[PDB]
Design a protein around this nucleic acid. Structure first.
Lengths: 19, 65, 121, 35, 459
RNA sequence: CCAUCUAUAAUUUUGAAUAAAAAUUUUGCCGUUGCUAUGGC
């Protein structure tokens, strides 16, 4: 039997700048 | 200015949350307060400040990060 | 047979030009024919780099006569516009000299190319 | 001071002119004219 | 009339136009978001018509024009509003020029048929030299040294310039009035290349101090400094993503920076004239990489001083495809000038056959974003148009434009017309000397001006 | 910076007409070549 297909990361980096 | 970056984001529905590592770039500044970072992370993630927790902040040698 | 001799192959020139740029950053480079004459007269030159496309070529043939008499390796490069690029000066350079410094941070690279130039000569 | 500048300027041109005569088997005057 | 309904009205009105213009509508909506997916989606190279291009040269009083930046308004699908700063600027195309005469000039290029038209300019001089002599006090309004680069903000509200004066001055587009000065705060930090992130206010500045600096123009502040280049960072390019690419000149390394990940990918050509010959059984080794343009978020191209144009893919560190001596070989030096001997044969021997010959340099290299075509420039006297293969594994010479005569310091392209039928205008800054300096010998016939070529599309 | 208000420019009424007037909306310098294009510094 084949192993479960890898799942891509659901979440990614998010970026913000201030002052 | 100050930059906030989040990496290694893991969705944790067992605790019903998102875990991540926070890197703060603060040139020409001592460091950023936890409440302020909570506010900005809340803005980025579109969630209440009350639902944002932040901790384990160590400034690298030489400052600025 | 040609007056400009020996003139380096393509691969060697980049190795030469790489050293020149490093020497320029480290204040170990003398640029222009007139400085090269002074360094030869002082006995302060590791070796001399020259441009084979100088117009006329003749104005830099005094240096090899000085270089040989002091047993200083010398070499030509095909392009003078390219030689100025490596030197960091805004203009073409027809001749350049690497000043001797056994305490320099780029001693190994200078001696590496210097060995190749003698084999060419 | 301006007089000295020309003398220094001419001295350099004489230097290159002296060269083009020396290591050339049959020197010409084409360059000496433009110099 | 809540804000959501307004978007619905604009979206409904937008959809009606597509129906009027025209399966087709479904594909067109996908193409609107094709930019977000960082893949090439503009296959028009075969449909280009170089031969019928209307070429024109516009002389400029400024000496040795150094760079060109062009601004194009774009409709924003999210809000259905044009990027124009004001209603007066609706569908007006602007192009900004810098030179070593310390002068910034803007032109209107909306009319493809007509030549560029000057609107305003600002000039610097010795008046702006800083008295303090401290780096952090180098906050004078105007420039006092050669200006090397210019970039126009995607919002059309600001234009930024930089040069050897180690300052980043951002000007108002309408009046060319300085609103902020951002010193680099480095002794050797001369600005060499500027690139705006597409559809964003983020700016990436490449400086002679071997560092890349990032700025936020809306905020007028510096953000981060990037390290890793071993030599001067001569050129920089960016696309919608934060993945800017740079070239380090003599270090001979192309660098892609992932700003979010804080990681870098290192690319090296690694070609040797020695091996190229036996596989053949004139090849010039690369000395420095001077130009770079990002064809795609996943592909980019570079140009070297040996006349080599190389295609790159992020998966592969080595070049995937190379085009050696793209612009040809420089003219052989005259035998009456190589030497002063009377006999002609003696002079010919000094030429040393063909061994003194050297190739043209790639002074300019620009690729249309997410397209299969890019333009290369040199002082050969012609702009060459190349088309990339569908598999993104090779490219071929689509054609040439011989109108330009002189050094192509920078190349820009602007488009207009319907989504089916477009006319492309290639604007290239032409100068008598190389932007970085006066090394190159004077090119016969070279003039200082803005080269323009309008290419119509048919098929 | 944006809008607005002026300014400049264009069509129109009285008007031989000027005139007012409502009204509206390719170069820093030097040449050659056309009636536009490129040679030198």
């Amino acid at each position: 039997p084949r192993a479960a297909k890898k799942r891509r990361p659901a979440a990614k980096g998010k970026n913000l700048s201030f002052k | 200015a100050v930059t906030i970056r989040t990496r290694k984001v893991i969705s944790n529905p067992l605790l019903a949350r998102k875990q991540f590592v926070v890197d703060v770039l603060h040139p020409n500044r001592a460091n950023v307060s936890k409440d302020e970072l909570r506010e900005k992370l809340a803005e980025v993630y579109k969630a209440e400040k009350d639902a944002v927790s932040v901790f384990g902040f160590r400034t690298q040698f030489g400052g600025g990060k | 047979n040609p007056k400009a001799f020996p003139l380096a192959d393509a691969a060697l020139t980049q190795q030469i030009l790489d050293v020149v740029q490093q020497a320029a950053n480290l204040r170990q480079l003398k640029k222009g024919a007139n400085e090269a004459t002074k360094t030869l007269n002082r006995g302060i030159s590791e070796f001399i780099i020259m441009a084979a496309d100088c117009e006329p070529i003749e104005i830099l043939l005094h240096l090899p006569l000085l270089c040989e008499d002091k047993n200083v390796p010398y070499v030509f490069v095909p392009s003078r516009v390219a030689l100025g690029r490596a030197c960091g000066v805004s203009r073409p350079v027809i001749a350049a000299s690497i000043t001797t410094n056994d305490a320099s941070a780029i001693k190994t690279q200078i001696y590496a190319v210097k060995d190749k130039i003698e084999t060419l000569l | 001071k301006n007089k000295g500048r020309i003398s220094r300027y001419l001295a350099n041109k004489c230097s290159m002119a002296s060269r083009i005569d020396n290591y050339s088997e049959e020197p010409s005057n084409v360059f000496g004219s433009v110099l | 009339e809540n804000p959501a309904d307004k978007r619905r009205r604009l979206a409904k009105q937008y959809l009606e136009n597509l129906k009027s213009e025209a399966d087709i509508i479904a594909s067109r909506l996908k193409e609107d978001v094709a930019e977000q997916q960082g893949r090439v989606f503009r296959y028009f190279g075969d449909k280009l018509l170089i031969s019928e291009a209307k070429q024109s040269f516009t002389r400029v009083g400024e000496n040795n024009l150094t760079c060109i930046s062009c601004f194009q308004p774009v409709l924003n699908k999210y809000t259905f509003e044009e990027s124009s700063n004001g209603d007066k600027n609706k569908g007006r195309l602007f192009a900004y020029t810098v030179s070593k005469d310390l002068q910034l000039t803007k032109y209107d290029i909306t009319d493809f048929s007509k030549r560029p038209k000057k609107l305003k300019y600002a000039k610097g001089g010795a008046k702006y030299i800083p008295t303090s002599k401290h780096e952090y006090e180098n906050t004078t309004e105007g420039h006092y040294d050669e200006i090397l680069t210019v970039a126009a903000s995607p919002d059309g509200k600001y234009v930024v310039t930089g040069g050897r004066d180690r300052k980043l001055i951002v000007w108002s587009t309408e009046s060319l009035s300085p609103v902020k000065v951002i010193p680099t705060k480095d002794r050797r930090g001369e600005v060499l290349s500027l690139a705006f992130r597409k559809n964003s206010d983020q700016l990436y500045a490449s400086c002679a101090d071997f560092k890349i600096r990032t700025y936020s123009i809306n905020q007028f502040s510096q953000l981060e400094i990037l390290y890793g280049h071993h030599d001067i960072v001569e050129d920089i390019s960016a696309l919608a993503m934060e993945r800017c690419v740079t070239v380090g000149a003599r270090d001979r390394t192309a660098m892609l920076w992932k700003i979010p990940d804080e990681t870098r990918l290192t690319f090296r050509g690694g070609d040797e004239p020695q091996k190229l010959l036996r596989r053949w059984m004139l090849f010039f080794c690369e000395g420095s990489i001077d130009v770079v343009s990002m064809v795609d978020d996943f592909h980019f191209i570079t140009g070297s001083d040996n006349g080599n144009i190389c295609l790159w893919s992020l998966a592969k560190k080595k070049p995937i495809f190379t085009e050696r001596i793209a612009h040809g070989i420089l003219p052989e030096p005259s035998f009456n000038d190589i030497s002063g001997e009377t006999d002609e044969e003696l002079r010919k021997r000094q030429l040393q056959g063909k061994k003194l010959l050297q190739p043209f340099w790639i002074t300019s290299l620009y690729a249309i974003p997410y397209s299969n075509v890019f333009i290369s420039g040199s002082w050969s006297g012609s702009l060459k148009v190349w088309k990339i293969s569908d598999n993104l594994r090779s490219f071929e010479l689509l054609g040439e434009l011989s109108g330009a005569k002189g050094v192509v310091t920078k190349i820009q392209v602007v488009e207009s017309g319907k989504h089916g039928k477009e006319k492309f205008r290639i604007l290239a800054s032409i100068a008598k000397e190389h932007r970085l300096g006066r090394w190159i010998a004077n090119v016969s016939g070279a003039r200082n001006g803005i080269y323009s070529a309008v290419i119509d599309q048919t098929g």
